[PDB]
Structure 1
Amino acid sequence: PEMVRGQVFDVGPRYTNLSYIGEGAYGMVCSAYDNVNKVRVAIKKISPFEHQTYCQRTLREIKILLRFRHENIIGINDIIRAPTIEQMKDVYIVQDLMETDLYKLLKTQHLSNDHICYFLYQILRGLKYIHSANVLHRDLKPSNLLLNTTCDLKICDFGLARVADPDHDHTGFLTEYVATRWYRAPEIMLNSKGYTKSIDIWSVGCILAEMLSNRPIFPGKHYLDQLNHILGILGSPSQEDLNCIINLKARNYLLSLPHKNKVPWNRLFPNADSKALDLLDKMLTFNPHKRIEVEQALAHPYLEQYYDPSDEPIAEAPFKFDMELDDLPKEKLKELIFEETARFQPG
């Protein structure tokens, strides 16, 4: 078997000429020449079978990405594993090789308004399809947006994704949460489990702001500091928006804070297109009920050059498996991963 950087990367014989790319969320990623469709591909090594959390996440991503078919959503081309459960230690996921991701691009490259507009359109186009399947991505951020050499964009990493559940969204104040801090909607820290579509719109809003300046808009250093950043720009919530927070701990915390003024978008972003800032304002609305939805965001004047609802497909069916893998142990999960990957085995 092939070795990379003191690591078994056991993908051959179909996949050869391995080049290390980097480390992703939970393991080694290489490029490799695919001897069947004669292209280089991306391959990530997943070794999840020891920890139940890794298993739940691996299974979610596999079930979701195999069901989804969309130009702005990374596919799975191939899955490599051992022929038996007993021999299966790692899973290799084979995906289109992309030039970069938005996180690497923002650290090195100024974006023209035209590039911002096209990136934003494709994020929303992919997101319309995800949300139409009753799925929440829940971890949208620049490193989960892949780009090829012609700036086509694909959403990746559905490991934290869930079926939408708006009726069970309420929780207490300062409830712990898994998804990436800087892209977390203010309601997460106040009264939300992140079980509604509005959670993803907030993250897209943060990504749009970060494309305008190359810097995260709300770079919190800890759980409650995240809220400090958001309120520093949005200013104090209105009485009406507070009245929607019924939980007393969350309400009273907000009431305890000194009054803060809204920082106008055009001061924060002096070079930005005014229509881009109108859409940003609507995505970064404090109150999740008043926050723009994906389809409304697509219809916004900023995106008029691209908007074409007949060419913005939705999913054939909602995603069935509600998230109910939560109670399943590592061993049933290994079995389910084995089953879900069976189609990529010779015959």
Structure 2
Amino acid sequence: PEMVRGQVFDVGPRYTNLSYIGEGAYGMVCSAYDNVNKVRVAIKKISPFEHQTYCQRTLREIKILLRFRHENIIGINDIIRAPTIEQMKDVYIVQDLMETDLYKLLKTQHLSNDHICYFLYQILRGLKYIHSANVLHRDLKPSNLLLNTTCDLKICDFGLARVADPDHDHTGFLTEYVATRWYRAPEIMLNSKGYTKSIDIWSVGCILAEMLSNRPIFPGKHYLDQLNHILGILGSPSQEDLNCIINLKARNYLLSLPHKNKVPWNRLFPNADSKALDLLDKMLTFNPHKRIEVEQALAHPYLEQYYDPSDEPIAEAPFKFDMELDDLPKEKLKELIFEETARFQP
């Protein structure tokens, strides 16, 4: 077997000539020549079986990505693993090879308004499909948006995804949360478990803002600082939006703050298209009930050049996990990962 930077990368015979791309939360990722389809592919090595939350995240990614089929969602082309549970220590996920991701692109490249528009359209087109399956991505951010050399965009990393559950979204103030801080909606810190579709729209708003300036709009340094940043731009919530937060700890925290006025988007983003800023405003609405939904966003004038609901497909059915994954021991989750990956064995 080939090794890559002091690590077995055990994918042959089918996949050879491994060129390391980089490490991450996604383990070691390499490109490799696929000797059957005669193209280079991406392959990511996952070693989750010791840690139960690693197993949960791995199983979610696999189950979701295998069920979904959409141009703006990364597919799984193949999964390589040992023929038996006893011998399975790693899983390799094979996907279409992408040139970059939006995190890397924003570090290095100014985006034209046409590119921002097209990227935003593709993110929302993919999100329409995900939400139509009653799934929440819950960790949308630049590093989870992959792009090929022709700027086709694909959403990746469904490791924190959940089925939507609005009736059980309410929680107390300062409840701990897992998804990436800079892209978290204000309500996460106040009264929300992130079980509604509005959570993803906030992240997309943050991504739009970041495309406009190449800098994160709300770069918080810790849990409550994130809310400081959001209120620093949106200004103090209205009485009506405050009255929607029934929880007294969360309500009174907001009431304790000095009055802050809204920073106009056109002063933060003087070069931005005015239609882009009108849509941005609607995605970065404080009150999640008044926040724009994905299908409304697609229909917004900013996206008129691309909008075509007949070519923005939805999922054939709602998604459901077989059972809750949070209570399952890792030995059941290893067996589930083994079963979910069986279709790729010869």
TM-score interval, normalised by the smaller of the two chains: over 0.9
Query: SS of the counterpart of 2:241?
Result: helix
Change (3 A) 1:180 1:256: same
Query: 1: CA distance between counterparts of 2:27 and 2:123?
Result: 25
Aligned-residue sequence identity (percent) comes to 100
Contact 1:183 1:202 in 2 (8 A): yes
Q: What is the SS of the residue equivalent to 1:24?
A: coil
Deviations 1:291-329 (A, max 9, x none): 000000000000000000000000000002287111000
SS at match of 1:57: helix
Gaps of 5+ in 1: none
Q: How far does residue 24 in structure 1 lie from its aligned partner after superposition?
A: 2.5
- Distance in 2 separating the partners of 1:324 and 1:116: 38
Summarize deviations over 1:264-303 as a string: whole Å, max 9, x none.
0000000000000000000000000000000000000000
- SS for the counterpart of 2:93 is strand
Q: TM-score, normalised by structure 1?
A: 0.99
8 Å Cα contact 1:47-1:89 kept in structure 2: yes
CA contact (8 A) 1:129 1:314 kept: yes
Q: Which runs of 4+ in 1 moved over 3 A?
A: none
SS in 2 for 1:92: strand
Which segment is superposed worse, 144-153 or 321-330?
321-330
Secondary structure of 2:65's counterpart equals helix
**Which blocks of at least 5 consecutive residues in structure 2 are unaligned?**
none
For the residues of structure 2 that align with 1:42 and 1:289, how far apart are their CA atoms? 39
Contact 1:20 1:29 in 2 (8 A): yes
With structure 2 as the length reference, what TM-score do the two structures score?
Answer: 0.99
In structure 2, the CA distance between the partners of 1:277 and 1:257, relative to structure 1 (3 Å rule), is same
How big is the shift at 1:26?
3.6
1:240 alignment counterpart: 240
Counting matched residue pairs gives 346
Q: Deviations over 1:84-122 (max 9, x none)?
A: 000000000000000000000000000000000000000
Q: Which residue of 2 aligns with 1:3?
A: 3
Corresponding residue number in structure 2 for 1:225: 225
* Closer, same or farther: CA 323–242 of 1 in aligned 2, 3 Å: farther
Change (3 A) 1:181 1:77: same
Please list, as runs of the form range in 1=range in 2, the aligned pairs for 1:45-84 lying within 5 A after superposition: 45-84=45-84
SS in 1 for 2:28: strand
How many angstroms apart in 2 are the aligned matches of 1:26 and 1:115? 27
Quick check: 1:173–1:247 contact (8 Å CA) kept in 2? Answer: yes
Distance 1:274 1:105 in 2: 23
Per the alignment, residue 90 of structure 1 pairs with: 90
Q: Report the counterpart of residue 137 of structure 1 in structure 2.
A: 137
What is the CA–CA distance in structure 2 between the aligned matches of 1:303 and 1:100, rounded to whole Å? 24
Q: For the residues of structure 1 that align with 2:8 and 2:17, how far apart are their CA atoms?
A: 14
Partners of 1:330 and 1:217 in 2: CA distance: 38
SS at match of 2:260: coil
Q: Can you list the C-alpha shifts for 1:7-45, whole angstroms capped at 9, x where unaligned?
A: 011000000000000013141000000000000000000
Q: For the Cα contact (< 8 Å) 1:163–1:323, is it kept in 2?
A: no
